[PDB]
Amino acid sequence: MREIVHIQAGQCGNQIGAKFWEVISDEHGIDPTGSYHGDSDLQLERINVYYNEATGNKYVPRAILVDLEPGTMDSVRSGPFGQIFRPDNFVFGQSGAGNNWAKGHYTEGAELVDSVLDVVRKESESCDCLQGFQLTHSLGGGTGSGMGTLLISKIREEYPDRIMNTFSVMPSPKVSDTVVEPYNATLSVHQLVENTDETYCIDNEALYDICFRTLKLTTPTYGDLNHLVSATMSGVTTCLRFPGQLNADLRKLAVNMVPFPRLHFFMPGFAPLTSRGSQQYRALTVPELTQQMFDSKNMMAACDPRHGRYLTVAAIFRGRMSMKEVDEQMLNVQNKNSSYFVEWIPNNVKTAVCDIPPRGLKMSATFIGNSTAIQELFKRISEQFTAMFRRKAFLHWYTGEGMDEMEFTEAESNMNDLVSEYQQYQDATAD
Amino acid sequence: MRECISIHVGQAGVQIGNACWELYCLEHGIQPDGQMPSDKTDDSFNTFFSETGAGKHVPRAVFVDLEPTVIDEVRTGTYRQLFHPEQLITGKEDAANNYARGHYTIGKEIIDLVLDRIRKLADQCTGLQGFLVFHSFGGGTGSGFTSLLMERLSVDYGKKSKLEFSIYPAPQVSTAVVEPYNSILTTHTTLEHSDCAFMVDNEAIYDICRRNLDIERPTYTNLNRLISQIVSSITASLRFDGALNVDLTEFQTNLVPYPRIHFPLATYAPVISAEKAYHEQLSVAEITNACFEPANQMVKCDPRHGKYMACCLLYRGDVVPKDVNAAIATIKTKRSIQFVDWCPTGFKVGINYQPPTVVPGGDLAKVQRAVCMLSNTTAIAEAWARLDHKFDLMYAKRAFVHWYVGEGMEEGEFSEAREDMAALEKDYEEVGVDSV
Amino acid sequence: FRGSLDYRPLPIDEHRICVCVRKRPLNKKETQMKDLDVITIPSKDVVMVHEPKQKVDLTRYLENQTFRFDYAFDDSAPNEMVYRFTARPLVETIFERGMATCFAYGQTGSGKTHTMGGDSKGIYALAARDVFLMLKKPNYKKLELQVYATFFEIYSGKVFDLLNRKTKLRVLEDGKQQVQVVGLQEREVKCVEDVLKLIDIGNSCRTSAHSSRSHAVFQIILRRKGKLHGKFSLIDLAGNERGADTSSADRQTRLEGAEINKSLLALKECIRALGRNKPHTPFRASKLTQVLRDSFIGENSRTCMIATISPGMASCENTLNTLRYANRVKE
Ligand SMILES: Nc1nc2c(ncn2[C@@H]2O[C@H](COP(=O)(O)OP(=O)(O)OP(=O)(O)O)[C@@H](O)[C@H]2O)c(=O)[nH]1
Ligand SMILES: Nc1ncnc2c1ncn2[C@@H]1O[C@H](COP(=O)(O)OP(=O)(O)NP(=O)(O)O)[C@@H](O)[C@H]1O
Ligand SMILES: Nc1nc2c(ncn2[C@@H]2O[C@H](COP(=O)(O)OP(=O)(O)O)[C@@H](O)[C@H]2O)c(=O)[nH]1
Ligand SMILES: [Mg+2]
Ligand SMILES: [Mg+2]
C-alpha cells in the first residue's frame, strides 16, 4: 500500500485542496514549478504517496480538479503552486449547480462523472500499490455534495477493495448564505454512511468561532478558514507522507479507528492556534500542547467531547522533543479522564511522532477523535432538516430533477438511527 | 547433519531475525560477506548454515514480509551479500494489522512460492530436524501468514519439528488496538501444530531495558538485540557440541508434559549496562539466583505463586559441572520452588563452553558466564488471561470484528477460538491438582 | 451411545417465533472419505450434539449438548413434513390480515435451498399451492383477494429483481410504516402454475461451487381493494461459510463470501441485540437487516425460522454456532 490518488471538487473542496497542496508541497520540498528544492531526505522516503514522477525531477501531484462552474479553474491558476498540476487532469464543467444536490447527482454531474472516471482510470493504470482514494469537498452546496456522493458510489462499485477516505466540511447558518443546505447535508450523509470508509468532519461554525474569539479577527474572510483546515490536513496526512510504524497506510489507519462499520465520523483538532503568516516566538511546549489538543477550544467540529466518550483517538506530534514526555502526557490525559473513554476498548489511543514539523511552527500536535459526542453534530442538522422537510420548501428543485422525494425521509430515518447508534455506545459498561 | 531451518515473518520476526543472525555470525565468526576463516568448505554450526562453493557460508533462513520496506533493509544493509537472494521473499500491501488478510486473502497467493523456496532449502539437507519460526503475536502478517504457513508445513513436513518464537504485544509500542484479536486467533489455529512456543513479553523486554540498561525510551533496536541474545542462549546447545551440552530436542522432551501445554517461560541471567561500567563478574551461584527473579524473566508473570513442571538451565561460558550442582543445592530447598506431585523435581543442565559474545556498541555489557533457564510453569497462564480480558470487552460488543469477517472469516470462528482459549486456561488449572 | 437410551420423551413454553431445525443426511463425499455422524434426534423436540472433546491428557470424552426446540426434523422427513409444521400453520396468518415470513438459516451445504428451491416440490411451491387451495374455500373467496408474487436477490450489498431480469432496486423507509422495496415488479397470478412459472424464472435467474450465492426473497402478496392486506415471505439465505474452508482464491468469490459473512454478522448482532434488548437495535447495518426489520418488529407479524445443520464431525463448529443462535432466537 503506497499510492494515494487525490481529488478536489466544488468551490470549498477545490479551495481546501489547493491549500493542502501548498503546505505539503512546501513541507516535502517541491518548488512552485516542480523540482525538488529540499534539504533532508526525510521528505522523499514516502514522497510517492502523493506525487507521480514525470522523469526529469518533475513531481506531478497525482491529483484531479473538477467543478460544474467554468470559473473555479481561474482560482487554480492564481494558486502560487498551481502550475504543477498535470494538464490532462483539468476536467471542468460549464453549467453550474447553484446550491442544488439533485442537479449535481441526477442531472449534470451525471454527465461529467464518466469524464472524471477515465482520468481516474489512467491515474490508477500507473500506480504500483494503489492504496485508496482521498477526497475534499463541502456538504451544503450543490456540486460537491451530490456529484461527490455519486462519484464515490461508482468508484466503490469499480474499486471495492480500496480504502474510501473523505474530508467533508459542514454547513451552518453562521457562514452559509442560502438555506438549501440542511437538505444537501442529509443527502450527503445518507450516501456517506453507506459508501465511505473514513470521514473527517470540519464544521464552519468551529472555524468561525476560532477566527473570532482566538485570532480576534472580527470580520472573518473565506481564506482565514482554508488556512485552519490545511494545517489539520498536513497534521493527519503526516502519517502517510513520512515513514513510521504507526498509521503506515490507510488500511492500518482505519483499523485502529473504526469499531463499527457505520460510525466513522472524526472530529479533528490542532494546537497551537495561529493566524496566517504569524510564527510563534513563545512556541508551545508539551503539557499545554496535549492539554489543549484534547480540550474543545482547538477542535475542528462543533462537538464538545466532554459530553460524549472517545471510542478511539490517534494523536500525532511533529518536531523534535522527548518521546517519554509525549507518551507520559498521553496516558496522563487518559487516566485522569478515564471517565471519557470506553473502558471496553483498551489501548485505544495511539500516538506517533514525526521529525519534520509544520511550517511556521517548531512543535505541533494534531488530533483525530472518533467520539460518541459527534452525534450532537448530527442532532443539529436533523433539526435544521426536520424543520424544513416537514414544510417541503424548495423540494421542486430536487424532486423535479429525477429524484424520489422519499429518498429524503430515507435519509432522516438513516441519520436518526445513526444518532441512536452513537448514543448506544455511550453508556454501555463492560458488563 | 541434523539440520534446522529458520523462518522469519512480519516486521518483528524479520528485524529480530536480523539481530539473531547478526549475533550468530559474531559468535560463530563470520563477516557480512559470508566468509569464514577457520572452516573447510559437517560441524555443529553446519546445521544453521550451509556451505556454498567458495566457502560463502550462507544461512538456512527464509524471510517474508507482505510489505517489502522491512526486508529491503536487508538488501541495502551490510549483509546484502550474505544471503542467497531468492529467499528474501516480499509482497506488496502489508496485512494492515489484520489476521484474516494473513491467513486467507493475501497469504494464499504467496504461500506456494514460499514453500517452493523453503523446499529449495530443504533439498540442500541430508537429515533436517525442524523449522524455527520467528514472528509476532500482534501484526497481521506475522499472525495470519504464520498460522497458514504452519498449517502447510504440517502437510508437507509432518515428521518434522516446529518451534515457535512468539512476541506478545506490549501496549507501549503496540501499533494497533486489535492486537488481542490477532493473538487469540493465531494461538488458536497454531496450537495443534506447533510443538514448543517460546513467548516474549515486549512489556518485559521494555522493563529490562528500563532497569538494567537504563534506557528511557528504548528503540526497537535495543529490544531486538536483547531478545537475540536470549535466543542465542537457547540455540547455542544446538549450534555447539561439547561433551557437556545436549540437543535442544533432547530436553525439549522434558519441557512439554502435555500436547497443549508447551509454553516455557524463559529467564536470562546477567543483564548489565556496558555504559554503567565498573563491574565484578558473577559466580555460577549468583546468576543461578538471578534465574528466579521476575525481573530477569521473559514473560510478565509470577512463578512464585505457581507450580513447576520442568526446569532447564543452558549455561554458556566458564562453568564447571560442580559449580552448577552447588548452585542447584543452594536454590533447591532454600526457596519456595514447587513441583506438581506427578513430576520429578530434577534439573538437566546444558553446559556450553563458548562465552556470550555481545554486540559492538551493543549496550549489553559483555560477560564471562551466563545462564538461560527454561521453566515450564503454570503461572504463564497469566499472559493468556491478560489477553482474554482485553479481548472479552471488545468481543462482548463485537467491536472491530467487521474487518476480520470483511476479509473472509466467519464470526463463529471467534467464539470457537475464545472458547478454546478458556479451555487452555482450565488445562493450566488441571495441571495443578494432585491425587490421594 | 446412539442406542441404549431414549426412555424419556417430551410440555414446552410460549415463544415469540416458531424456531425449528432440520438435519440432513450424509452424502457420497462424507461417506467415501469416512466422516462420522455426530447429530442425533430421538424425539420430534430434541436436537442432540455429540461434541467430540479431548481433555488435557488426551482422554477422549463426549460433551453431550442437548437442545430442545419447537420441532426437530431428523435425517429422513421430506419437504412435505418440514412444510407442514414450519410454513403451513403460517398460511393462516396472511389471510387474516397478517404479515408472516420464513427463514432458511444454516451453513453452506446444510440444505436451505433444497428445502426452499426444491430440485421442484419446494416450500415455495407448496406454500403457494396451499395459498390457492384455501382461496378456493368459500369463506376465503368472500374477500376477493388478488394474488401477487415477487422474487429478488441481494448480492454484493445491492438489490436486484429476478423477475425483472437483474434490475437494480433501491431500498427506502419513510414515515416509518414499512421498508419500501422501491422498483419491485409485482406479478399478478391467479393459479398454482402461474406461481411455478415465476418460481422457475427466479430459481434459474439466481447467481451461482454449485451453491446459492445470493439472498433470495420470494413473496406471496394479497391486496383486497388494492390496498395491502397479506404478505407471506419465504427466504432462502446463503449459508454462513467458514473462511477456514479456503475457496480457490478468485477475485469475485472472496467478495461474495466476505459480503455474505458480513450481512450474516449484522443479522447476528441484531439477534444478540434483541435477546438482551439494546434500545438501539442496529437494523441499518446491512440491506438484509433493513429488510427483516418488519419481519421481526412488525405490528401484526408472525414468522418462522427453519434452521439447518450438517451431521458430520467436520461441521460441528458451524453446527454449534447455528444451534446456539437458534436457541437465542426462541424469544
Ligand atoms: N520486539 C519487537 N516487536 C516488534 C517489532 N516490530 C513490531 N513489533 C510488535 O509487533 C506488533 C505489530 O505487528 P508488526 O510485526 O509490526 O506488523 P507486521 O508483522 O509487519 O504486519 P503488518 O504491519 O500488517 O505488515 C506490535 O505490537 C509490536 O510490539 C520489533 O522490531 N521488535
Ligand atoms: N432433506 C434432505 N435430504 C437429502 N439431501 C438434502 C436434504 N436437504 C438438502 N439436501 C442436500 O443439500 C444439498 C445442498 O443444498 P443447498 O441448500 O443448495 O446448500 P446450501 O445450504 O443452500 N448452501 P448455500 O447455497 O450457500 O445456501 C442439496 O444438493 C441436497 O442434495
Ligand atoms: N471554509 C470554507 N467554506 C466554504 C468555502 N466555499 C464554500 N464554503 C461553504 O460551503 C457551502 C456551499 O458553498 P459552495 O462551496 O459554493 O457549494 P458547492 O461547491 O456546490 O459544494 C456554503 O455554506 C459555504 O459556507 C470556502 O472556501 N471555505
Ligand atoms: Mg509488515
Ligand atoms: Mg442456498
Residue numbers in the entry:
A (entry chain D): 1 to 44, 47 to 360, 369 to 441
B (entry chain C): 1 to 41, 46 to 440
C (entry chain E): 204 to 213, 218 to 326, 335 to 423, 430 to 552
Which of the paper's sentences describe this entry?
Kinesin-13 proteins are major MT-destabilizing factors in higher eukaryotes and a specialized class of motor proteins in the kinesin superfamily. Rather than moving directionally along MTs, kinesin-13s catalyze tubulin disassembly at MT ends. Human Kif2A is a 706-amino-acid kinesin-13 that functions as a homodimer in vivo. A monomeric motor domain construct that includes the kinesin-13-specific neck (Kif2A-NM; amino acids 153–553) exhibits the ability to catalytically depolymerize MTs in vitro, similar to that of the full-length dimeric kinesin-13 as previously reported.
The MR solution comprised one Kif2A-NM monomer bound to the concave side of a curved assembly of two αβ-tubulin dimers arranged head to tail and capped at the plus end by DARPin. The final structure was refined to a resolution of ~3.5 Å, giving electron density maps that show well-connected main chain density for all subunits of the Kif2A-NM–tubulin–DARPin complex. Notably, the N-terminal section (residues 157–195) of the neck of Kif2A can be seen interacting with one of the tubulin dimers (labeled α1β1; buried surface area = 915 Å2). The other dimer (labeled α2β2) is occupied by the Kif2A motor domain, which contains MgAMPPNP in the active site. Residues 160–185 form a well-defined helix (α0a) that runs antiparallel to helix H12 of β1-tubulin. Many of the positively charged residues in α0a juxtapose the large patch of negatively charged residues on the surface of β1-tubulin. The Lys262, Val263, Asp264 triplet (KVD motif) of Kif2A interacts with both β1-tubulin and α2-tubulin at the inter-dimer interface. Val263 inserts into a hydrophobic pocket formed by the non-polar atoms of Tyr262, Pro263, Arg264, Ile265, Asp431, Glu434, and Val435 of α2-tubulin, while the Cα and Cβ atoms of Asp264 of Kif2A are nearest to Tyr262 of α2-tubulin and Lys402 of β1-tubulin. The most striking change from isolated Kif2A involves a ~26° rotation of the α4 and α5 helices, allowing L12 to engage helix H12 of β2-tubulin. In contrast, the tubulin dimer bound by Kif2A’s neck is much more curved (15.3°), and there is an even larger bend at the inter-dimer interface (15.8°).
